[PDB]
Each structure stands twice: as structure tokens, then as C-alpha cells.
PDB file of C-alpha atoms and ligand atoms in Angstrom:
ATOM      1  CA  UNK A   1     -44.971 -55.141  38.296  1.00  0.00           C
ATOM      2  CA  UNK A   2     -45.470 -52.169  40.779  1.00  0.00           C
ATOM      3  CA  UNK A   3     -46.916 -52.380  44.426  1.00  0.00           C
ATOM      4  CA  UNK A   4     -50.686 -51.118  42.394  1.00  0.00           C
ATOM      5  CA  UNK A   5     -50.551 -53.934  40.021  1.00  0.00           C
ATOM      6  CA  UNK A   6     -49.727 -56.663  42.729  1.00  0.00           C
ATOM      7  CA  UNK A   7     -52.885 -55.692  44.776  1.00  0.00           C
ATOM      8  CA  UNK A   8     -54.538 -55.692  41.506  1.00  0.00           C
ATOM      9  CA  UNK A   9     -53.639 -59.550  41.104  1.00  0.00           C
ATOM     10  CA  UNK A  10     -54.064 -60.242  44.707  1.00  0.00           C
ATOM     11  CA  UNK A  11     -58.084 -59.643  44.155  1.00  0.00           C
ATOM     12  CA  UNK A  12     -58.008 -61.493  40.829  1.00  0.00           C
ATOM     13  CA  UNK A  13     -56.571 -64.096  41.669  1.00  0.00           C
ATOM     14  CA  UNK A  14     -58.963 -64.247  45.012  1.00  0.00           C
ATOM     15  CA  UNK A  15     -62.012 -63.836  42.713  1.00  0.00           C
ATOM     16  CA  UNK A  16     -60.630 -66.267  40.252  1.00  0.00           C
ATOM     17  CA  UNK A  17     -60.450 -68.830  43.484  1.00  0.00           C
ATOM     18  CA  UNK A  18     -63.929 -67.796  44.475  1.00  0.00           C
ATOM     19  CA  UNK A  19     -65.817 -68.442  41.246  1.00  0.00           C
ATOM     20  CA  UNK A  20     -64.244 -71.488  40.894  1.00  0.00           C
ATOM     21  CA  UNK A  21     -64.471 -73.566  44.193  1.00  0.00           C
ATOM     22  CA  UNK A  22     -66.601 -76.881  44.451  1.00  0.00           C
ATOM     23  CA  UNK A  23     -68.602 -75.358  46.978  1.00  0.00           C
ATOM     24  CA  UNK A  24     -68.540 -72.266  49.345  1.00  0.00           C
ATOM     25  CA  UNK A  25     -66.922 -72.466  52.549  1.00  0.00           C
ATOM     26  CA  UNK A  26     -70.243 -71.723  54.345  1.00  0.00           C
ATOM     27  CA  UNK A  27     -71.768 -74.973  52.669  1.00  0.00           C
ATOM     28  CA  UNK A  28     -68.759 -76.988  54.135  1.00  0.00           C
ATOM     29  CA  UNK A  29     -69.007 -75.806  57.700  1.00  0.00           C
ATOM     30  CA  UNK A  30     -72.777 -75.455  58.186  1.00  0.00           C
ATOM     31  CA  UNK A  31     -73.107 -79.042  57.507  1.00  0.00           C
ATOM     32  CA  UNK A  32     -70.633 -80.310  59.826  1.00  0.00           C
ATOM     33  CA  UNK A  33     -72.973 -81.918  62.698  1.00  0.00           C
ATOM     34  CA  UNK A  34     -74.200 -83.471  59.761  1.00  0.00           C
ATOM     35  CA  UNK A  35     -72.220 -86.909  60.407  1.00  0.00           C
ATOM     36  CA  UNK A  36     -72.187 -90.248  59.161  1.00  0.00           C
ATOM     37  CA  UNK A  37     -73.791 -93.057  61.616  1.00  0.00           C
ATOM     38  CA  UNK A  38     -71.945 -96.111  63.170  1.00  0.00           C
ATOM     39  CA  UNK A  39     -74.280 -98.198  60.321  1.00  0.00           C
ATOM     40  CA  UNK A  40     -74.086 -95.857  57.207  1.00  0.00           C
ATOM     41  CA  UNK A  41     -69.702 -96.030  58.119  1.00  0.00           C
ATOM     42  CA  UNK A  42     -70.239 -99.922  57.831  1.00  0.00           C
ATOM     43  CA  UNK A  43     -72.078 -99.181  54.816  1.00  0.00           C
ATOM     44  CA  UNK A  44     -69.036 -97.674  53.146  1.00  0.00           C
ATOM     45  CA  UNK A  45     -66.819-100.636  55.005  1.00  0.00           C
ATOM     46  CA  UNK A  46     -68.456-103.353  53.616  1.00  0.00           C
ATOM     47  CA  UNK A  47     -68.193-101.887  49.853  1.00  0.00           C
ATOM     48  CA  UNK A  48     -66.302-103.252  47.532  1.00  0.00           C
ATOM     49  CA  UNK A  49     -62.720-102.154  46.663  1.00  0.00           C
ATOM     50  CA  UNK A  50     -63.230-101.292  43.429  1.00  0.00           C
ATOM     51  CA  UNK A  51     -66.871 -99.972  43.751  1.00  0.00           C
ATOM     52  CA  UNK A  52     -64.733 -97.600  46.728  1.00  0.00           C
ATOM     53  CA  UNK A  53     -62.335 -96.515  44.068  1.00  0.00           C
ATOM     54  CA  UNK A  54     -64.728 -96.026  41.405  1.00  0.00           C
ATOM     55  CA  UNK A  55     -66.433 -93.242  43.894  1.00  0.00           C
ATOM     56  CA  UNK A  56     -63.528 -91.651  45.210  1.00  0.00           C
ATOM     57  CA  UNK A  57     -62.259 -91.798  41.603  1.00  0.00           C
ATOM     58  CA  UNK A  58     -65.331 -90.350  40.482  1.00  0.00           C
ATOM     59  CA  UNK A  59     -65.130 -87.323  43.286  1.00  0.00           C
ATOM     60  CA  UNK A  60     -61.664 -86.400  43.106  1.00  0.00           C
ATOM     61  CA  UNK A  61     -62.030 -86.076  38.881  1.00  0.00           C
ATOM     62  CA  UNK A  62     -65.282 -83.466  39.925  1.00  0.00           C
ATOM     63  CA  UNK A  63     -62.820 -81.357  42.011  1.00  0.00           C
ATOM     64  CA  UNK A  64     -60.104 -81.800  39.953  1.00  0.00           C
ATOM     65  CA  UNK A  65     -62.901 -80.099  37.224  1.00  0.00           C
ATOM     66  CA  UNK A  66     -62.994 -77.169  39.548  1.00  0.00           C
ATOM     67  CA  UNK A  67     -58.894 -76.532  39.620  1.00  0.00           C
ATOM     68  CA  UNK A  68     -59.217 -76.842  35.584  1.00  0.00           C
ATOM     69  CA  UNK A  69     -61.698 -73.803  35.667  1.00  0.00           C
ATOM     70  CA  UNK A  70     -59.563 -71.928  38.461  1.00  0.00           C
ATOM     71  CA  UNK A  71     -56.302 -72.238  35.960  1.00  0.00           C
ATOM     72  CA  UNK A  72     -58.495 -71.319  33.299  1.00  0.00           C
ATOM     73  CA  UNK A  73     -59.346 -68.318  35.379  1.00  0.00           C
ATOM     74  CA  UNK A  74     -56.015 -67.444  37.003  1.00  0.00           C
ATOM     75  CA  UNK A  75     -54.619 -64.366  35.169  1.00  0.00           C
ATOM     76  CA  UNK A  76     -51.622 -65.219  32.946  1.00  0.00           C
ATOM     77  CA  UNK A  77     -52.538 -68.606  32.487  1.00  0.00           C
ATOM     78  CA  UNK A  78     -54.226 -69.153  29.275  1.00  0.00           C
ATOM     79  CA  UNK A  79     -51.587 -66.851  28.281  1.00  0.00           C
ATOM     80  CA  UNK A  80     -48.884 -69.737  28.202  1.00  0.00           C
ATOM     81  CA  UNK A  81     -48.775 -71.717  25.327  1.00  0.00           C
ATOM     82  CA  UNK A  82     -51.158 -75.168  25.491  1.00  0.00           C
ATOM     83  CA  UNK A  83     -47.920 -77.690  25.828  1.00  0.00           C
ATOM     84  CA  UNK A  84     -47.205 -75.304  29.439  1.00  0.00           C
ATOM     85  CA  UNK A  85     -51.123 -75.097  30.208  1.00  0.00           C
ATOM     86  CA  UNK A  86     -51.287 -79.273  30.373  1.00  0.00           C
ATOM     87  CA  UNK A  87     -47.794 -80.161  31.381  1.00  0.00           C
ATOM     88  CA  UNK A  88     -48.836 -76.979  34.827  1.00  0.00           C
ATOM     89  CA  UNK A  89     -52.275 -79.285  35.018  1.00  0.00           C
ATOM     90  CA  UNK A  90     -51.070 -82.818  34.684  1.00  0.00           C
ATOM     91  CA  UNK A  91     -48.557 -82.092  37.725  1.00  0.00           C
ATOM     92  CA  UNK A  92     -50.385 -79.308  39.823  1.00  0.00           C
ATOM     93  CA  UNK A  93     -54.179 -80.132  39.654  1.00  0.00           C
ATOM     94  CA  UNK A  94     -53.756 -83.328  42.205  1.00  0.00           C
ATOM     95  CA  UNK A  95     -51.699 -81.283  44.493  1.00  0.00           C
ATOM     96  CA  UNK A  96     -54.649 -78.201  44.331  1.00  0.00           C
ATOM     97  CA  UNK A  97     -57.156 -80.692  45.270  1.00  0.00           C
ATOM     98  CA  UNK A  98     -55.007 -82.006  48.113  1.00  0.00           C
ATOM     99  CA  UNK A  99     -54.699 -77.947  49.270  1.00  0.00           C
ATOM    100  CA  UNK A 100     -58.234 -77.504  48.915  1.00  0.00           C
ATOM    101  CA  UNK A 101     -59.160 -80.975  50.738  1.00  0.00           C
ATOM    102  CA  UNK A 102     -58.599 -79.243  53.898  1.00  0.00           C
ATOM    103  CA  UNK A 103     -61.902 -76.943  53.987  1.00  0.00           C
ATOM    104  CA  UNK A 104     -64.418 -79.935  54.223  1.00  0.00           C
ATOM    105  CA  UNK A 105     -61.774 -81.484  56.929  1.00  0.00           C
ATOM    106  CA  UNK A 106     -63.089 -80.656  60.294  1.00  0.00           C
ATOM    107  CA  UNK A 107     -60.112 -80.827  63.201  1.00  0.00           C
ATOM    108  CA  UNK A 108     -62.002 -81.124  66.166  1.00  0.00           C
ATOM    109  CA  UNK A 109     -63.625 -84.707  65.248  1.00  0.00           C
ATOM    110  CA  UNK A 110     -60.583 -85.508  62.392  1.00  0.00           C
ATOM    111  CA  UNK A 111     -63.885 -86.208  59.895  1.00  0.00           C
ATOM    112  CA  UNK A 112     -63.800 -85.250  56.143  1.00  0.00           C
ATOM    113  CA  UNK A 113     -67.145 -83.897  54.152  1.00  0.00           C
ATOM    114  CA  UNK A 114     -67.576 -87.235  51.873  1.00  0.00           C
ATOM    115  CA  UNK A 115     -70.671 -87.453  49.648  1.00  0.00           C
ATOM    116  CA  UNK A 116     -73.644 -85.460  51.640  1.00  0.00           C
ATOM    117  CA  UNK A 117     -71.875 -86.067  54.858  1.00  0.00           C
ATOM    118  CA  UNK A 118     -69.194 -86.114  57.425  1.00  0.00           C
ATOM    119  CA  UNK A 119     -67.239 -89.465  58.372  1.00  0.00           C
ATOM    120  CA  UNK A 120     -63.262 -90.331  59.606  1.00  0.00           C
ATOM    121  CA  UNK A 121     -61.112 -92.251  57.635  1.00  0.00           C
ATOM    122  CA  UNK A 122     -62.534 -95.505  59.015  1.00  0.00           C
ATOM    123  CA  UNK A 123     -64.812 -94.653  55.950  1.00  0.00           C
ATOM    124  CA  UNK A 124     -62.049 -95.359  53.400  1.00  0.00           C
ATOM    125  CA  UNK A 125     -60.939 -98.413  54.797  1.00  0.00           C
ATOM    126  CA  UNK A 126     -62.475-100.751  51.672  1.00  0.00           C
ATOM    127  CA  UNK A 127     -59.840 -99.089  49.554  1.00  0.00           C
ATOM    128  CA  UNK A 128     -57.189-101.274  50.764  1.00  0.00           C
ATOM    129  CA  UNK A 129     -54.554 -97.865  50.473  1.00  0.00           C
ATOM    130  CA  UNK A 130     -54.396 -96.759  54.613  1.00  0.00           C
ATOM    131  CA  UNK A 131     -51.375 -94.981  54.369  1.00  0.00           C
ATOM    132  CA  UNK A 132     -52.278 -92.802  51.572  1.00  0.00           C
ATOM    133  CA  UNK A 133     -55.503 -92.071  53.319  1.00  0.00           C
ATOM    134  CA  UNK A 134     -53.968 -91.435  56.819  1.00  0.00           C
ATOM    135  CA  UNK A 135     -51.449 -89.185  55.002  1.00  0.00           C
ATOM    136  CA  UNK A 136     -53.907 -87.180  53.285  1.00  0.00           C
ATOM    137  CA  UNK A 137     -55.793 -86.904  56.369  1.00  0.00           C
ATOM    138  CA  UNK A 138     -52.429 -85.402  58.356  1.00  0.00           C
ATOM    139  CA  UNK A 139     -51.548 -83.081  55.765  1.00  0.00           C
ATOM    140  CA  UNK A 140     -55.134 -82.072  56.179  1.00  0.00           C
ATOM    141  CA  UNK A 141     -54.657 -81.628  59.674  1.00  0.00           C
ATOM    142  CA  UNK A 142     -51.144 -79.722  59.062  1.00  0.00           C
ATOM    143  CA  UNK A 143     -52.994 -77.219  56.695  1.00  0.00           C
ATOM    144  CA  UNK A 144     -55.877 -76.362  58.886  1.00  0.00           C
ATOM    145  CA  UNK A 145     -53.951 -75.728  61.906  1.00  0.00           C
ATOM    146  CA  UNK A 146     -52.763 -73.103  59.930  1.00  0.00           C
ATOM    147  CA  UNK A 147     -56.161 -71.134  59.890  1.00  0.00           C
ATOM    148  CA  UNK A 148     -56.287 -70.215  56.334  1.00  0.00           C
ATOM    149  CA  UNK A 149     -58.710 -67.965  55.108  1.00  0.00           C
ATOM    150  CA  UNK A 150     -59.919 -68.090  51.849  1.00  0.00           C
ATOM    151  CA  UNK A 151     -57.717 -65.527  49.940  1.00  0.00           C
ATOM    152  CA  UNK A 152     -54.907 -67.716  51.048  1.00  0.00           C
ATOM    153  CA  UNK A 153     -55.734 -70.498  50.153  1.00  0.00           C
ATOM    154  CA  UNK A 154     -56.754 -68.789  46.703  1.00  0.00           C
ATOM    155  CA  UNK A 155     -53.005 -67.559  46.377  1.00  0.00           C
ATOM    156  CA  UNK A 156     -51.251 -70.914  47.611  1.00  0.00           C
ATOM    157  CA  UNK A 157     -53.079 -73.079  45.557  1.00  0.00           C
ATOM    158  CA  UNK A 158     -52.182 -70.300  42.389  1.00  0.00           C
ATOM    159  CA  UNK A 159     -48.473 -70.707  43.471  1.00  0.00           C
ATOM    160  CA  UNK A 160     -49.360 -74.470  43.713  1.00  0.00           C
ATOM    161  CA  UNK A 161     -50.537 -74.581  40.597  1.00  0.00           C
ATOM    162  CA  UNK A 162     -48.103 -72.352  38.595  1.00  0.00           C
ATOM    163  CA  UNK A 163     -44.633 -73.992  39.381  1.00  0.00           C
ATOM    164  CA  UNK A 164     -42.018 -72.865  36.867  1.00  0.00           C
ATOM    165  CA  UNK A 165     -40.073 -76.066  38.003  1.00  0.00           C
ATOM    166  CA  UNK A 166     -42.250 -78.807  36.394  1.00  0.00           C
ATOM    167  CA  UNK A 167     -40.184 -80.903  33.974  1.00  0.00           C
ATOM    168  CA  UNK A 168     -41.374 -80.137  30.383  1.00  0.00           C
ATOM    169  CA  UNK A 169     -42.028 -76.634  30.101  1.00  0.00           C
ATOM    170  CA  UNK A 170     -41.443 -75.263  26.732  1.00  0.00           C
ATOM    171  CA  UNK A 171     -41.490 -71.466  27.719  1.00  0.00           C
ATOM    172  CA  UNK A 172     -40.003 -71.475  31.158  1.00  0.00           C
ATOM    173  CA  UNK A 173     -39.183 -68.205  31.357  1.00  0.00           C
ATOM    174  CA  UNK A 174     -42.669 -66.983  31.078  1.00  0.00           C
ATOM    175  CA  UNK A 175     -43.622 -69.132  33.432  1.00  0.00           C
ATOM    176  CA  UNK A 176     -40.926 -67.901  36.064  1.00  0.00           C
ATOM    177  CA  UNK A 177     -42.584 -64.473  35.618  1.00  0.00           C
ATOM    178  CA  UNK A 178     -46.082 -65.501  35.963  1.00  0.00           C
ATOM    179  CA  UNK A 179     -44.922 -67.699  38.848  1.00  0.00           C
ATOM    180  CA  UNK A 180     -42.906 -64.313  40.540  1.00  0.00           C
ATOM    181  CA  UNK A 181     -45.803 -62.189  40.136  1.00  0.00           C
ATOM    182  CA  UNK A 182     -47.902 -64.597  41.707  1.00  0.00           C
ATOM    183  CA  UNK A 183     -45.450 -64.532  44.850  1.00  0.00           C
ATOM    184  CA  UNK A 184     -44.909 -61.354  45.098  1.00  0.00           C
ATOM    185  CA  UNK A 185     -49.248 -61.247  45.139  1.00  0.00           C
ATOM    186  CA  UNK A 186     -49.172 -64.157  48.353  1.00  0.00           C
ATOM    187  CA  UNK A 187     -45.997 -62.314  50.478  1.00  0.00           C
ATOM    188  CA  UNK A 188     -47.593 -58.723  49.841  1.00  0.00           C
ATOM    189  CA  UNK A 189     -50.822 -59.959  50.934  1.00  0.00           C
ATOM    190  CA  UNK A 190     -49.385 -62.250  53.900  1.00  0.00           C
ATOM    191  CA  UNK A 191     -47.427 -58.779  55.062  1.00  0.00           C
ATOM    192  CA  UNK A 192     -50.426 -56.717  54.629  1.00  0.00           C
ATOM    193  CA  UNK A 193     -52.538 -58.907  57.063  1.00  0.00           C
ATOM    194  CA  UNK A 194     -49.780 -59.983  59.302  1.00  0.00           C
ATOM    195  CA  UNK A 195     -49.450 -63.261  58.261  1.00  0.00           C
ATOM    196  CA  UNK A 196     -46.102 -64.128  57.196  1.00  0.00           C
ATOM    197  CA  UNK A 197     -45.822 -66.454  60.202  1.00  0.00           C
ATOM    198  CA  UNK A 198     -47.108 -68.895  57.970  1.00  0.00           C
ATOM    199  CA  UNK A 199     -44.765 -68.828  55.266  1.00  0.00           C
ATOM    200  CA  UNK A 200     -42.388 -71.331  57.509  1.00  0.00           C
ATOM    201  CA  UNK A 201     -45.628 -73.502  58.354  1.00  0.00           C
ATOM    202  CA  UNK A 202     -46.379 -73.963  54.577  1.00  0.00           C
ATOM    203  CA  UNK A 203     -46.359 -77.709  53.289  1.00  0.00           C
ATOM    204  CA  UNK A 204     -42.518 -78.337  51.509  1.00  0.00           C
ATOM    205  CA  UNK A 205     -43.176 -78.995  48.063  1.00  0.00           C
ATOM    206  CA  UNK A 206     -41.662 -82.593  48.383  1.00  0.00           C
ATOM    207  CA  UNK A 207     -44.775 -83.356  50.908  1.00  0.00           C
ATOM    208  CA  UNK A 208     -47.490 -82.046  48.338  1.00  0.00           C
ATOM    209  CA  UNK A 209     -45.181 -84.195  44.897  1.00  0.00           C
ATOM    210  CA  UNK A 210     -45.117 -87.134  47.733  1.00  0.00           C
ATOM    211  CA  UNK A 211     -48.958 -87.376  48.403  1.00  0.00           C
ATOM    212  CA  UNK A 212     -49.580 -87.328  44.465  1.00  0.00           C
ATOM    213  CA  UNK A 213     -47.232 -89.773  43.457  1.00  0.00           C
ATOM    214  CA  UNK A 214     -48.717 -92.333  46.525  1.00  0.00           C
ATOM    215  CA  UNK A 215     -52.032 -91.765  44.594  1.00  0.00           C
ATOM    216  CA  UNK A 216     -50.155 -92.898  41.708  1.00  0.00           C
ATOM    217  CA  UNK A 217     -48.670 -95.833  43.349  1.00  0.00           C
ATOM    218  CA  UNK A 218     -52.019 -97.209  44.703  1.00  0.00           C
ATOM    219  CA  UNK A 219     -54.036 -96.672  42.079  1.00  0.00           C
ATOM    220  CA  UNK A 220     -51.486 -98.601  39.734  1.00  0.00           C
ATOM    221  CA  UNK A 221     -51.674-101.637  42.061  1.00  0.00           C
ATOM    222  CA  UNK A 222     -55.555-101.171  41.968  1.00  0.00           C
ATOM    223  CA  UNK A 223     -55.419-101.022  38.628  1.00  0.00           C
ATOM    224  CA  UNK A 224     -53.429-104.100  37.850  1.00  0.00           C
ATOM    225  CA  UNK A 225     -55.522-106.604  39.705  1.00  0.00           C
ATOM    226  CA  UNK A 226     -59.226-104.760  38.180  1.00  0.00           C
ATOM    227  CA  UNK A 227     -57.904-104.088  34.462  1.00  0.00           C
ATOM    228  CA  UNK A 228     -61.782-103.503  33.195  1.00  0.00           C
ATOM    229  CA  UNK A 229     -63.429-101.866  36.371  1.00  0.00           C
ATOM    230  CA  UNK A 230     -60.318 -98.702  35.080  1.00  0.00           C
ATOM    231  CA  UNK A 231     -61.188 -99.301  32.001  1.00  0.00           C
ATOM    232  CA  UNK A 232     -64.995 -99.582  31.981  1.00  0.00           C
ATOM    233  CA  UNK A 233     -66.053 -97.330  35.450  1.00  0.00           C
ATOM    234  CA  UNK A 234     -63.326 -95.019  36.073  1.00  0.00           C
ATOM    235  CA  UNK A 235     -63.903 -91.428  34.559  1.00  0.00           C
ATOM    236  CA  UNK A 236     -61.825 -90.497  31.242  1.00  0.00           C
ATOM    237  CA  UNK A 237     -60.094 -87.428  33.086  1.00  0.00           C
ATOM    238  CA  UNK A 238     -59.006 -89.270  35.948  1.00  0.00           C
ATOM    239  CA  UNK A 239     -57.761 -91.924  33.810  1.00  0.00           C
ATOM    240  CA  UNK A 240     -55.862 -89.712  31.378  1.00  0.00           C
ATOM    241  CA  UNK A 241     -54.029 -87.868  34.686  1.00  0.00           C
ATOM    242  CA  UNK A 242     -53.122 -91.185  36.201  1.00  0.00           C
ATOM    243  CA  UNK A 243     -53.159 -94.867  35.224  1.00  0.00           C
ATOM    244  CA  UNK A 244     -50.571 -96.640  33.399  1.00  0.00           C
ATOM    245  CA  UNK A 245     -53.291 -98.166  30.970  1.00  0.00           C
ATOM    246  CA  UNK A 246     -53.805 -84.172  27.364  1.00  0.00           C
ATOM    247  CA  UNK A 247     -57.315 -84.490  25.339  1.00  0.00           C
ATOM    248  CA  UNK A 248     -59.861 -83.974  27.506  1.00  0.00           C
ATOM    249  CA  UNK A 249     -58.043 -81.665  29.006  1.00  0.00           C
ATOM    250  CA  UNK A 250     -57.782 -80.010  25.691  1.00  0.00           C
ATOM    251  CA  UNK A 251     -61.112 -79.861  25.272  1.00  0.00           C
ATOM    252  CA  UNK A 252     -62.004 -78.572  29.074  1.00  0.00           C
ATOM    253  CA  UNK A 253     -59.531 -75.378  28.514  1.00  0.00           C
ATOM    254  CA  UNK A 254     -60.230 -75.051  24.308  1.00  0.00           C
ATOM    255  CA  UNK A 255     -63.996 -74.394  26.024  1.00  0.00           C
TER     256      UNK A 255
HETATM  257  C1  LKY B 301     -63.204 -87.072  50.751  1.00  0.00           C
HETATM  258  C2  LKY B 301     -62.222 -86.225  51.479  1.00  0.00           C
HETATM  259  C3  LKY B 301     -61.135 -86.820  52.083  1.00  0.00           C
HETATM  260  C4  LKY B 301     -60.960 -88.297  52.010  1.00  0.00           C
HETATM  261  N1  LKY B 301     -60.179 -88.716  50.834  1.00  0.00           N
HETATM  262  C5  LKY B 301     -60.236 -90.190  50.692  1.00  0.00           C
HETATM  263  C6  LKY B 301     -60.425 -90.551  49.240  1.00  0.00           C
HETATM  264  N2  LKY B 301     -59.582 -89.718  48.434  1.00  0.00           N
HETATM  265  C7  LKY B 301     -58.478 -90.222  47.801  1.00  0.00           C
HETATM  266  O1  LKY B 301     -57.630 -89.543  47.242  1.00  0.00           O
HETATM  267  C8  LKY B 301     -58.412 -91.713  47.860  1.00  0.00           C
HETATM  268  C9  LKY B 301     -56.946 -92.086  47.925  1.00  0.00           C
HETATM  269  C10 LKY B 301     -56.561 -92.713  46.610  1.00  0.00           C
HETATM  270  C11 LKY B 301     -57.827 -92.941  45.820  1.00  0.00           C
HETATM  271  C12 LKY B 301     -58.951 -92.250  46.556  1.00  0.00           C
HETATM  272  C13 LKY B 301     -59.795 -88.296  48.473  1.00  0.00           C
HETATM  273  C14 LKY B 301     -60.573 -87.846  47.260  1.00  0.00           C
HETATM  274  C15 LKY B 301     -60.614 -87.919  49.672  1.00  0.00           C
HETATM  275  C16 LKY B 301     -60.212 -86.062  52.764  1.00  0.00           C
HETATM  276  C17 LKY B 301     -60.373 -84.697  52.843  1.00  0.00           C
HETATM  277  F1  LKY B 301     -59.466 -83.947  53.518  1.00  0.00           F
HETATM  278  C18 LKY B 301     -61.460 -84.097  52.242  1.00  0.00           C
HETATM  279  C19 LKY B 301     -62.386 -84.856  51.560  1.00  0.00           C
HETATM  280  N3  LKY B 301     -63.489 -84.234  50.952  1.00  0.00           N
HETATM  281  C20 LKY B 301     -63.317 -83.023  50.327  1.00  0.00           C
HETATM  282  O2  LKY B 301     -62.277 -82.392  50.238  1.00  0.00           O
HETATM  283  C21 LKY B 301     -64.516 -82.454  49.718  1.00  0.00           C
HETATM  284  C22 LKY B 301     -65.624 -83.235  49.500  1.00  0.00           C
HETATM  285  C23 LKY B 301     -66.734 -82.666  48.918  1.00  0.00           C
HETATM  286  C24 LKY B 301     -66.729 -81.333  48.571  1.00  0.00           C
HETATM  287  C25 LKY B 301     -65.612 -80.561  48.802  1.00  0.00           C
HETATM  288  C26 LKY B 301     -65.605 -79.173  48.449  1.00  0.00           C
HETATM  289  N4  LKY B 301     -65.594 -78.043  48.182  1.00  0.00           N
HETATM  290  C27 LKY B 301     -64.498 -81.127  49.376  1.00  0.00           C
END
């Protein structure tokens, strides 16, 4: 690629992000006084573990849904063959969700946009999985003290997303080049606004595989002692992405 091309997939990958986030980053911050009270947090408390998961389960496959669309999207991407397209989801999509948890987090009160409104992690307690939850929440913090606009988050999470290191590639090499292009599109952009600062302040890539695989963990031991609630209330695409007990994901980028 030449420097006219790059800026050319700097906007389409920023437009690609745009049309394809859960919800605008206006919606997230104008309802941020709008906070959960002490009783509706003992609400969420008092829950059930697996009713809990089932929710967050249900949540996390909706903006999971979103990254789908956003690879589907991304220029280059359908372009790989379908064995590159899942094997790039199946690894990546968790980790762009984690990226993009951090524009409903809100520093100043450490509360996370959570089904209409804002609560802490006190809210999550019921899942019995602290750690995981108090991670997420730090890595949230890390990423917003950052101050990311939206174009970079747009050309992380593509970067994120498009990792010519994930085991079982079949056509590496074109992946390599996608994933070049793509970062050469985030450092010209970065140098263009002045930003490169944060290149050093980025996330290593054995935080973002270490989050993920903690989801993993927890929801196996979840899973083992509530076999059916899995089975019977969890959504197929979170199920297929995660549990020990490629399709619709098929399906989702064949449409
Ligand atoms: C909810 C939320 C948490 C809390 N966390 C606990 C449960 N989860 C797990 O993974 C649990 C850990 C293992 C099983 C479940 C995450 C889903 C969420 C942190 C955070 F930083 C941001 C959010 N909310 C959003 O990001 C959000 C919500 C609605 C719309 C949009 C948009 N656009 C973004």
C-alpha cells in the first residue's frame, strides 16, 4: 500500500467500527447519572448464580453479535477463506468485546452501563467469579485512562481482531498482510493526530488472551455444577465460543 491507500483504510475501517457498534457513544455517556439504587444493586445480589450467568451470558453473546458484523465489515476480511474468518472470530471476538467494554465504563464512579443502567461491580457479585470481574473492571480502567476516541478504538479493536498469530490459520500469509495494512492504518493515524504516546500504554496481548481464557475458566466451573441451565438457557453462540459441553457463526457471516 501507499500513504493514499492507508488513509483510505483508516476511514473504512472507522466507518466499518461506526456502523457496527452496540450503541453510540453519546447513548453511553448521556445516561451516566442514570445509576442503579442501593435496593435495585441488592436486586442483582440476591439473584441467583445461574440466573446471573444466564444474563451476562445473554449480553456478552449480543455484543459479541456486533464484533461479528464489524469483521464482516472490516475490509479484507471476508476476503480470507471461511476456516481463517472463524478460527480470527473464535479467538478475537471475546477480546473486542473486552476493548469495547470500556465506553459504557465510567472512571470517575468505577460503574459499568449494565442493562438500562449504571452500577459497580458489587452488581456482579451473585456470579461467584470476583476476580474475573475485578479484572475486567481494571483493564477497563487501564483503557480509559487512555482517552480513546472512537477511531481508535475502531483501529485497535481491527488489529485486535485480525491477529496473524492465532494458531490454525490456513492462509497465514494473507493474513500477515491484512494484519500489516491494518497497522500501518493505526500508527499513520496515531502520528497524524499526535498520539503515538499511546502505543506503549496499549494492553500486552498476554493481558487481553489472559482475561478471555479466565472467562473460560469460570464459566467451565459454572458449567459443571449447572449442566442443564448451559444447556437449556445459555444462548447457542455463546455456547459454541466457550463451554466444554463454527455453525452459527457460519450462518451469521454466510448472511
Ligand atoms: C456489563 C459491563 C461490565 C461488567 N461485566 C460483568 C459481566 N461480564 C462478564 O464477562 C462476566 C464475567 C464472566 C461471565 C460474565 C461482562 C459482560 C460485563 C463491564 C464493563 F466494562 C462494561 C459493561 N457493559 C458494557 O460494556 C456495555 C453494556 C451495554 C451496552 C454497551 C455498548 N455499546 C456496553
Amino acid at each position: 500500500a501507499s500513504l493514499t491507500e492507508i488513509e483510505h483504510l483508516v476511514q473504512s475501517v472507522c466507518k466499518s467500527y461506526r456502523e457496527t457498534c452496540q450503541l453510540r457513544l453519546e447513548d453511553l455517556l448521556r445516561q451516566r447519572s442514570n445509576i442503579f439504587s442501593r435496593e435495585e444493586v441488592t436486586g442483582y445480589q440476591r439473584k441467583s448464580m445461574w440466573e446471573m450467568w444466564e444474563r451476562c451470558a445473554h449480553h456478552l453473546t449480543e455484543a459479541i453479535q456486533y464484533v461479528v458484523e464489524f469483521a464482516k465489515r472490516l475490509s479484507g476480511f471476508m476476503e480470507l477463506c471461511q476456516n481463517d474468518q472463524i478460527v480470527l472470530l473464535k479467538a478475537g471476538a471475546m477480546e473486542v468485546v473486552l476493548v469495547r467494554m470500556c465506553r459504557a465504563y465510567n472512571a470517575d464512579n468505577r460503574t459499568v452501563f449494565f442493562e438500562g443502567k449504571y452500577g459497580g461491580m458489587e452488581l456482579f457479585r451473585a456470579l461467584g467469579c470476583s476476580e474475573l470481574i475485578s479484572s475486567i473492571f481494571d483493564f477497563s480502567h487501564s483503557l480509559s485512562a487512555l482517552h480513546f476516541s472512537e477511531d481508535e478504538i475502531a483501529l485497535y479493536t481491527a488489529l485486535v481482531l485480525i491477529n496473524a498469530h492465532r494458531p490454525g490459520l490456513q492462509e497465514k500469509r494473507k493474513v500477515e498482510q491484512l494484519q500489516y495494512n491494518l497497522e500501518l492504518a493505526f500508527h499513520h493515524h496515531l502520528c497524524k493526530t499526535h498520539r503515538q504516546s499511546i502505543l506503549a500504554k496499549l494492553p500486552p496481548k498476554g493481558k487481553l488472551r489472559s482475561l478471555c481464557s479466565q472467562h473460560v475458566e469460570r464459566m467451565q466451573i459454572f458449567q459443571h455444577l449447572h449442566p442443564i441451565v448451559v444447556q437449556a438457557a445459555f444462548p447457542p453462540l455463546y455456547k459454541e465460543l466457550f463451554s466444554t459441553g463454527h455453525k452459527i457463526i457460519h450462518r451469521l457471516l454466510q448472511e
